[PDB]
């Protein structure tokens, strides 16, 4: 046998054991059968094994063969498979089980069972062979479009490699289907299959060529085969007849080109493929080759073309402004203090609401104590709602939270406590579908008015921002113009002007001169933050292709130091002046550095060098200003202006200054009179 | 390298940990990967069963946030689950903890602090987990190899999203069977 | 092992199968143990097999070993023998 080895004897159970080692390097076709991203062994393969081992030990007919869970073929070094043959009972019948375990696995890991069945003796004397001359194809059979069939299987999920794509013609005739199959490549080695598992599966493919299966557009594999007798030997091309045996079962009879019956299946039953039953084979990625980086995307709904309404019942803490929004559309049927009161009012003849809203309050401290409370309260409430009897239960239970999610890719604030309730219900929605909804609101009272519209949208979770409804969708991450910059593959890079003369042209670009070896007097800094001057905007603009380097200043942690440099060592926090600091790596002159004061942020630190050095260099070293002198500072509310005012006050200088009249508060706060 | 016995929810054990970090090598980053599973349906989940699962996720994350204000972390990474986003059934408390974590990163990024929550898919490499692997497969989640999982950790370091979902999905198998969750509708 | 071959795997019962071929031409001493006119394999032989195969698959101690009916050694071409090892139960016993 091309796969199986010699039969290993068994005294205890009584019978034999057929071992086999599976590998794609040994049999490249073992992977060329795949469904929905999983290279697996076809059910047709377990049949060949059964008819071969069964003919040898008396039971050449399969009464029943059941498949429990498919065996996936991974990359090279596939898993070993073992077939067990049972002892002959009082009627000659022998049991069967098939098992597989990953190659080389330890004795402590167990085997998965893939197939079990029951074999019987059957005589070929009855109906040995057919007549070579009946018109085949039968008269009046409709030709089936075989053109591009292999592309059409792929689209649905029957990913068939070069070894199984052998259906070359077929015809439908009412209940029944006739088809011809042939191995794409004949097998040249003397260890050969009687009928290749590829050629049988090609026959199995012809079930989906008819209308035997429901129009539910889902994928179906062989699950259980009853009454399988094989007679002939050595058939690489076949002529297949398929009729429905029962209502949910079909009978398959295939012959050779000469009409000799090769194999006949008295009944095959297929069953849809559990999504559960797959492990990645990565043949031709139908989804997620090796995994991908996804993020949720809150995408705003178009404003609804018409007013939407439900019957609403508000149960509990009526946030001020909420009821007003629900009642505008005319959907507010009742306010209540708790569920117990609602249940009674409606039994007493109140309105049956379409939606019962539960206002979750914000303001909880972000701590462990309030989370347990928020969860256990929602947990108690959900349990109360499911025990609600009557038509009131059919209503949707709307949890209405306040800023429990991050809608926009910005610095949007959030309430982690409410988002813990959001997650509890997230699982509850799956356990009890259609029972609960999540709708998150911002602090805008306008959003309370969109809440009817939100619930005109059958989405299970929802968010409203400025009266606009957003729905969440998972999305694979990809670069996007009109969006944030993506740093290059290198460890070192910087922000640099693109030369197009536009801010869209700013790009994070490789910066090798940062990684480069140090000259004397230099240090290398793992930058944490960098400052920005109005000049760095003007450089980003301007259409000359060669532009100055952006950045003037920053703060961070040192990583290397030249051997002449003292006073700075690897690991020291520092701020200072350097060009090209708009990236994670920069080289700098040790002279222009200082140690970051205890307790500063890297942002505070990086802000300082440009403004205060300019204001210090100018007040003290250029103008040599003295105590008692008078100073004028234009644009005193600006960057260098504020810095100049702070030094000037320390130096005994009478300061006058100008700024936009809206910035006078900034000047009067730096200690200046309305006369100044 | 040091290994320390410390329940990250015991605010006194964690403070005693941090205080015993060398002054010449101060804390500069954190990777939070503490986690506990205790599964039960909504109608079945108890009070202690909730406390037991929030304790490593929510209770610990908050202590790390409040005990490290005097240090500016260059990275602060939180491990979550994709069952918090999808709503794996019978795991209400687990989803609540991991949903709190997801938001608590959005809550740090809002304040100007480094943070990222990673709602992990399923890893290749245990009874409480052997129940979850069943439920994440029933929903179309496929296992991430060990190297590939780390590669996503690395690449997510380059993306400015407070919440990110490193995961491998068999989207075709849900379209085939018709079990596509609303959240995944655009991946077909 | 001088008599046993490699362990053959077993998924159904769970465990292993140690084959061995017996022959006086291969092991002349196999017949040199005889009682009342019958050359047989001593009980001591089944113990060696058990302690060797048992040490390898964890269970190196024999709690109990029962002999049902002796195996006689005829002339050349003696009979093959197979040992089966059970799966590890809740206590590690096989
Ligand atoms: N490395 C360098 O090249 C370097 C070094 C030091 C300083 N600088 C310069 O210092 C500034 C630092 O940038 P920054 O972020 O701190 O911005 P900023 O200077 O703080 O704000 C801009 C100021 O300029 C005033 N201004 C000038 N022309 C104006 C106009 N036509 N209309 C209205 N206001 C005008 C504004 O007056 P109001 O007060 O009325 O708003 C405002 O105060 C840059 O201009 C930079 O070129 C550059």
Do A184 and A317 have their domain in common? no
For helices B11-19 and B60-67, angle between their N-to-C axes, nearest 10 degrees: 40
How far is the C-alpha of A626 from the C-alpha of A640, rounded, in Å?
A: 20
Which of A480, A296, A526 shows the shortest CA–CA distance to B105?
A296
And the tokens for A576? 């200072």
Contacts with A383 from chain B: Cβ below 8 Å = 42-43
DSSP A534-569: HHHHHHHSS--SS-PPP--EEEEEEEEE-TT--S--
How far is the C-alpha of A616 from the C-alpha of A624, rounded, in Å?
A: 10
How far is the C-alpha of B187 from the C-alpha of A485, rounded, in Å?
A: 24
And the tokens for C32? 């040199």
Determine the distance separating the centroid of ligand 1 and the alpha carbon of A580, expressed in angstroms: 21
Give the distance, in angstroms, between the CA of residue A69 and the centroid of all CA atoms in the same chain.
25
How far is the C-alpha of A422 from the C-alpha of B85, rounded, in Å?
A: 10
Q: Tell me if A291 and B168 make a contact (CB, 8 A cut-off).
A: yes
Radius of gyration of chain C (CA): 15
A17 vs C8, C57, C88: nearest CB: C8
Determine the distance separating the centroid of ligand 1 and the alpha carbon of A589, expressed in angstroms: 27
CB within 8 Å of A390: residues ≥ 6 apart: A346, A347
Do A249 and A359 have their domain in common? no
How far is the C-alpha of A260 from the C-alpha of A232, rounded, in Å?
A: 7
Widest CA span in chain C: 45
**Which CATH number fits the domain that encloses residue A151?**
3.10.129.110
In this structure, what DSSP letter does residue A86 have? P
* Strand partners for A172: A142, A177
Under an 8 Å CB criterion, which residues of C touch A?
8-14, 16-17, 19, 57, 80, 82, 84, 88
Q: Tell me if C10 and A19 make a contact (CB, 8 A cut-off).
A: no
In the block, which residue shows the tokens 């000049």?
A: A535
**Cα angle: A363, vertex A367, A370; to 5 degrees:** 60
How far is the C-alpha of C13 from the C-alpha of A95, rounded, in Å?
A: 13
> Which of A:503-522 have CB within 8 Å of B?
none
What sign results for the dihedral spanned by CA atoms B164, B167, B172, B176?
Answer: negative
How far is the C-alpha of A83 from the C-alpha of C73, rounded, in Å?
A: 32
> Which of C16, C26, C27, C33 is labelled catalytic?
C33
Do A256 and A302 have their domain in common? no
Do A62 and A202 have their domain in common? yes
Do A327 and A373 have their domain in common? yes
Residue A522 and residue A589 in contact, taking contact as beta carbons nearer than 8 Å: yes
User: At A482, is the secondary structure helix, strand, or coil?
Assistant: coil
| Alpha helix (H) residue ranges in A579-662 | 602-616, 639-650
List phi, psi (to 5°) of B64.
Answer: -60, -35
Residue B14 and residue B6 in contact, taking contact as beta carbons nearer than 8 Å: yes
And the tokens for A466? 């400025």
How far is the C-alpha of A555 from the C-alpha of A553, rounded, in Å?
A: 7
DSSP B60-105: HHHHHHHH-TTS--SEEEEEEETHHHHT-TTBHHHHHHHHHHHHHH
Contacts with C21 from chain A: Cβ below 8 Å = none
In the block, which residue shows the tokens 């159970």?
A: A13
What sign results for the dihedral spanned by CA atoms A465, A471, A477, A483?
Answer: negative
How far is the C-alpha of A263 from the C-alpha of A124, rounded, in Å?
A: 11
For helices A416-431 and B92-110, angle between their N-to-C axes, nearest 10 degrees: 150
Radius of gyration of chain B (CA): 18
* Strand A396-402 versus strand A436-441 pairing type: parallel
For helices B92-110 and B47-54, angle between their N-to-C axes, nearest 10 degrees: 40
Which of A154, A227, A170, A226 shows the shortest CA–CA distance to A203?
A170
And the tokens for B92? 């209400």
Neighbours of A367 (CB within 10 A): 15
How far is the C-alpha of A553 from the C-alpha of A135, rounded, in Å?
A: 90
> Would you give the end-to-end CA distance of chain C in angstroms?
21
Q: Tell me how far CA of residue B153 lies from CA of A401, B100, B116, in angstroms.
A: 31, 20, 10
CB within 8 Å of B16: residues ≥ 6 apart: B6
How far is the C-alpha of A372 from the C-alpha of A421, rounded, in Å?
A: 10
Radius of gyration of chain A (CA): 39
Do A206 and A127 have their domain in common? yes
How far is the C-alpha of B117 from the C-alpha of B165, rounded, in Å?
A: 8
How far is the C-alpha of A81 from the C-alpha of A102, rounded, in Å?
A: 9
Contacts with C57 from chain A: Cβ below 8 Å = 107
How far is the C-alpha of C30 from the C-alpha of B128, rounded, in Å?
A: 54
A·C CB contacts under 8 A: 38
In this structure, what DSSP letter does residue B184 have? G
CB within 8 Å of A566: residues ≥ 6 apart: none
Q: Tell me if A111 and C57 make a contact (CB, 8 A cut-off).
A: no
How far is the C-alpha of A179 from the C-alpha of A240, rounded, in Å?
A: 5
Residue ranges making up the domain that contains A317: 298-476
Widest CA span in chain A: 126
In this structure, what DSSP letter does residue A48 have? H
Which residues of B are known binding-site members? 7, 33, 35, 57, 94, 123
Upstream peptide bond of A137 is cis (omega within 30 degrees of 0): yes
Do A207 and A313 have their domain in common? no
And the tokens for B156? 């997510």
What sign results for the dihedral spanned by CA atoms A451, A456, A460, A464?
Answer: negative
Q: Tell me how far CA of residue B172 lies from CA of A161, A504, B178, in angstroms.
A: 18, 37, 10
Q: Tell me if A11 and C88 make a contact (CB, 8 A cut-off).
A: no
Residue A593 and residue A574 in contact, taking contact as beta carbons nearer than 8 Å: yes
Determine the distance separating the centroid of ligand 1 and the alpha carbon of A611, expressed in angstroms: 11
**Cα angle: A142, vertex A144, A148; to 5 degrees:** 165
Q: How many CA atoms lie within 13 A of A505 on its CB side?
A: 16
How far is the C-alpha of A533 from the C-alpha of A35, rounded, in Å?
A: 58
Do A445 and A355 have their domain in common? yes
Residue nearest to atom 25 of ligand 1 (CA): A635
Residue A92 and residue A79 in contact, taking contact as beta carbons nearer than 8 Å: no
CB within 8 Å of B78: residues ≥ 6 apart: B32, B61, B101, B102, B104, B105, B115, B116, B117, B118
Do A268 and A307 have their domain in common? no
Do A376 and A250 have their domain in common? no
Task: For chain A, give the number of residues.
Answer: 676
User: At A502, is the secondary structure helix, strand, or coil?
Assistant: coil
Residue A309 and residue A315 in contact, taking contact as beta carbons nearer than 8 Å: no
Q: What is the resolution of this structure in A?
A: 3.4
CB within 8 Å of C52: residues ≥ 6 apart: C1, C4
Instruction: For A68-201, list the strands marked E by DSSP.
Output: 80-85, 94-101, 112-120, 142-143, 158-160, 167-173, 176-182
Task: Name which of A5, A7, A12, A94 to mutate to probe chain C: the one with the most chain C Cβ atoms within 10 A of its Cβ.
Answer: A12
Task: For chain C, give the number of residues.
Answer: 94
And the tokens for A42? 């076809």
Distance from CA of A357 to the nearest CA of B (A): 20
How far is the C-alpha of A608 from the C-alpha of A613, rounded, in Å?
A: 8
**Cα angle: B178, vertex B183, B187; to 5 degrees:** 70
Report CA dihedral (A656, A658, A663, A666) to the nearest 10 degrees: -20
In the block, which residue shows the tokens 């964690």?
A: B14
User: At A89, is the secondary structure helix, strand, or coil?
Assistant: coil
| Run of H or E including A242 | strand A237-244
And the tokens for B41? 């349906």
Nearest residue in chain A measured CA to CA from C8: A8
And the tokens for A93? 């019948």
Q: Tell me how far CA of residue A113 lies from CA of A17, A71, A317, A511, C12, in angstroms.
A: 15, 9, 56, 57, 9
Write out chain C in H/E/C secondary structure: CCCECCCEEECCCCEEEEEECCCCCCCHHHHCCEECCEEECCHHHHHHHHHHHHHHCCCCCCCCCCCCCCCECCCCCCCCEEEEECCCCCCCCC
Contacts with C59 from chain A: Cβ below 8 Å = none
Q: Which chains touch A (3 or more CB pairs under 8 A)?
A: B, C
Do A252 and A302 have their domain in common? no
Residue A371 and residue B58 in contact, taking contact as beta carbons nearer than 8 Å: yes
CB within 8 Å of B89: residues ≥ 6 apart: A427, A430, A431, B41, B135
Question: Residue A403: is it exposed, middle or buried by C-beta count within 10 angstroms (0-12/13-18/19+)?
Answer: buried
**Which CATH number fits the domain that encloses residue A378?**
3.40.50.11460
Ligand 1: list residues with CB < 6 Å.
A 533-535, 552, 610, 614, 635, 637-640, 659-660, 663
Burial B144-180 (b: 16+ CB within 10 A, else e): beeebbebbbeebeeeebbbbbbbbbbbbbbbbbeeb
Do A254 and A402 have their domain in common? no
Contacts with B177 from chain A: Cβ below 8 Å = 218-219, 272-275
Domain made up of B1-184: CATH architecture = 3-Layer(aba) Sandwich (3.40)
How far is the C-alpha of B10 from the C-alpha of A247, rounded, in Å?
A: 64
- Is A216 catalytic? The answer is no
And the tokens for A637? 């509310």
User: At A94, is the secondary structure helix, strand, or coil?
Assistant: strand
How far is the C-alpha of A334 from the C-alpha of A352, rounded, in Å?
A: 10
Determine the distance separating the centroid of ligand 1 and the alpha carbon of A534, expressed in angstroms: 6
Neighbours of A19 (CB within 10 A): 16
How far is the C-alpha of B25 from the C-alpha of A557, rounded, in Å?
A: 13
Residue A433 and residue B42 in contact, taking contact as beta carbons nearer than 8 Å: no
């Amino acid at each position: 046998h091309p796969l199986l080895g010699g039969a290993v004897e068994l005294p205890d159970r009584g019978g034999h054991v057929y071992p086999a080692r599976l590998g794609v390097r040994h049999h490249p076709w073992l992977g060329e059968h795949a469904l929905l991203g999983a290279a697996i062994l076809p059910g047709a393969a377990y049949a060949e094994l059964a008819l071969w081992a069964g003919r040898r030990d008396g039971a050449g007919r399969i009464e029943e063969l059941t498949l429990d869970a498919p065996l996936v073929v991974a990359d090279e070094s596939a898993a070993q498979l073992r077939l067990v043959v049972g002892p002959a009972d009082a009627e000659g019948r022998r049991q069967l089980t098939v098992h597989s375990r990953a190659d080389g696995a330890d004795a402590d890991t167990a085997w998965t069972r893939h197939a079990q069945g029951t074999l019987v003796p059957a005589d070929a004397d009855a109906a040995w062979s057919g007549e070579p001359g009946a018109p085949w194809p039968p008269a009046g059979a409709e030709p089936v479009e075989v053109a591009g069939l292999y592309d059409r299987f792929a689209d649905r999920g029957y990913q068939y490699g070069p070894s199984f794509r052998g259906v070359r013609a077929a015809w439908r005739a009412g209940d029944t289907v006739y088809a011809e199959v042939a191995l794409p490549v004949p097998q040249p080695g003397s260890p050969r299959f009687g009928v290749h598992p590829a050629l049988l599966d090609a026959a199995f493919q012809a079930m989906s060529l008819g209308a035997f299966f429901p129009e539910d557009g889902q994928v179906r594999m062989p699950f259980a085969l009853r009454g399988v007798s094989s007679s002939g030997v050595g058939a690489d091309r076949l002529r297949v007849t398929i009729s429905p045996a029962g209502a949910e079962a079909v009978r398959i009879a295939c012959v050779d080109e000469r009409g000799n019956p090769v194999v006949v299946i008295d009944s095959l039953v297929a069953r849809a493929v559990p999504v559960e039953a797959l492990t990645p084979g990565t043949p031709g990625i139908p989804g997620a080759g090796d995994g991908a980086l996804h993020h949720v995307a809150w995408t705003a709904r178009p404003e609804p073309g018409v007013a939407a309404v439900q019957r609403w019942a508000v149960v509990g803490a009526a946030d001020p402004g909420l009821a007003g929004g629900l009642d505008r559309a005319g959907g507010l049927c009742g306010a209540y203090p708790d569920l117990a009161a609602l249940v009674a009012a409606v039994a007493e003849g109140a309105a049956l609401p379409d939606v019962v809203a539960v206002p979750v309050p914000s303001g909880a401290p972000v701590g462990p104590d309030a989370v347990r409370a928020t969860v256990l309260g929602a947990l108690d409430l959900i349990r109360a709602w499911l025990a609600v009897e009557g038509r009131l239960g059919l209503a949707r239970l709307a949890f209405v939270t306040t800023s429990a999610v991050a809608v926009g890719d910005g610095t949007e604030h959030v309430d982690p406590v409410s988002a813990a309730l959001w997650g509890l219900v997230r699982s509850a929605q799956s356990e009890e579908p259609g029972r609960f909804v999540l709708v998150d609101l911002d602090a805008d009272p306008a959003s309370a008015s969109a809440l009817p519209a939100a619930l005109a949208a059958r989405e299970p979770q929802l968010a409203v921002r400025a009266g606009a409804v957003h729905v969440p969708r998972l999305v694979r991450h990809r670069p996007r113009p009109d969006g944030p910059l993506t740093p290059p593959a290198g460890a070192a890079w910087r922000l640099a002007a693109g030369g197009q003369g536009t801010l869209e042209g700013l790009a994070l670009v490789p910066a090798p001169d940062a990684e480069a070896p140090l000259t004397p007097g230099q240090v290398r800094v793992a930058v944490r933050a960098a400052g920005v001057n109005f000049r760095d905007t003007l450089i980003a603009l301007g259409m000359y292709p060669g532009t100055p380097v952006l950045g003037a200043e920053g703060a961070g942690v040192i990583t290397e130091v030249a051997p002449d440099v003292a006073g700075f060592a690897p690991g020291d926090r520092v701020l200072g002046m350097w060009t090209g600091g708009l990236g994670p790596v920069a080289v700098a002159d040790a002279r222009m550095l200082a140690r970051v004061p205890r307790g500063w942020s890297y942002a505070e630190a990086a802000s300082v060098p440009a403004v205060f050095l300019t204001a210090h260099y100018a007040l003290t070293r250029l103008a040599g200003i003295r105590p008692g002198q008078s100073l004028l500072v234009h644009a005193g509310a600006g960057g260098v202006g504020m810095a100049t005012l702070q030094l000037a006050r320390h130096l005994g200088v009478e300061v006058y200054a100008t700024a936009s009249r809206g910035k006078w508060d900034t000047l009067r706060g730096l200690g200046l009179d309305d006369a100044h | 390298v040091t290994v320390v016995a410390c329940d990250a929810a015991d605010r006194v054990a964690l403070r005693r940990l941090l205080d015993g970090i060398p002054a010449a090598h101060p804390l500069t980053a954190v990777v939070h990967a503490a986690g506990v599973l205790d599964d039960a349906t909504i109608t079945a989940l108890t009070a202690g069963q909730v406390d037991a699962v929030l304790r490593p996720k929510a209770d610990a994350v908050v202590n790390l946030h409040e005990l490290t204000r005097d240090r500016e972390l260059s990275a602060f990474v939180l491990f979550s689950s994709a069952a918090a986003l999808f709503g794996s059934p019978g795991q209400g408390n687990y989803s609540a903890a991991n949903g709190f974590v997801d938001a608590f990163a959005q809550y740090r990024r809002a304040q100007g602090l480094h943070a990222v929550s990673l709602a992990w898919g399923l890893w290749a490499d245990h009874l409480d987990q052997e129940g979850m692997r069943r439920r994440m497969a029933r929903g179309g989640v496929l296992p991430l190899t060990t190297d590939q999982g780390l590669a996503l950790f690395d690449a997510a370091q380059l993306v400015d999203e407070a919440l990110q979902v490193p995961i491998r999905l068999n989207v075709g198998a849900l379209r085939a069977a018709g079990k596509v969750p609303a959240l995944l509708a655009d991946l077909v």
